[PDB]
Amino acid sequence: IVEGSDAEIGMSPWQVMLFRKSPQELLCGASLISDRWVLTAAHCLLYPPWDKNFTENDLLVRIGKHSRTRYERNIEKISMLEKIYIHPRYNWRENLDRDIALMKLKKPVAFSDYIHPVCLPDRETAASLLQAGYKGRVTGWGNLKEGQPSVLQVVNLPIVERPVCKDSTRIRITDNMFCAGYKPDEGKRGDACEGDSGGPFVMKSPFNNRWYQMGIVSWGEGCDRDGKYGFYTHVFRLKKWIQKVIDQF
């Protein structure tokens, strides 16, 4: 996260860290959507242009964390993966279209003050909140500049009009994406960056005071460049695939 702030304890109890076994390192963010399921970006697991192709046994998820590097004894839970699901039509060749994956934990994790699942949006929630100018919140332990924070970082960013998102890049944008960030004249900054991938973009519903995950940190050109924007996987547009995977498996 670039130009963010230190999160508060308990601020994002759905935040998940994907952690590589060996070497031991930070892969990505992710989010807890139930006792048994974790949502993240497909490009965190699979991206052949960088020879990235992780499987169940290469990774651990770490839930309940604040510090990037400490083992937060008595606080964090570390879980192993039973299975990974990547969207069948994930387009890693071109524009990261459908950048989404589900992960099934080996055993359910116990909820606590620091661990708690975020809601998935329904059609009406999405229609109401997913609007240019409305702000969401992005969290992660990723790079501070295009060096690495000691604790979880947070930043709030406005959703940007689709035509402006299109006009900022050569990349083909699709309906499964939205972009977010301040424009160059708005005089505020911030973006996700490397190591933030797969993290949740969340909004708080004014109607029921609940937190909803609207996006997944997907891609960008650099981090926090003027005239560029962060792109996010559009969670509700892919929700059918999500429901399909879950109650089938």
Binding site: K21, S22, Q24, E25, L26, L60, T69, R70, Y71, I78, M80
Partner: peptide, 11 residues
Amino acid sequence: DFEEIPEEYLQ
């Protein structure tokens, strides 16, 4: 850079 986690988890 990262503190070692309990050995069992790396199992």
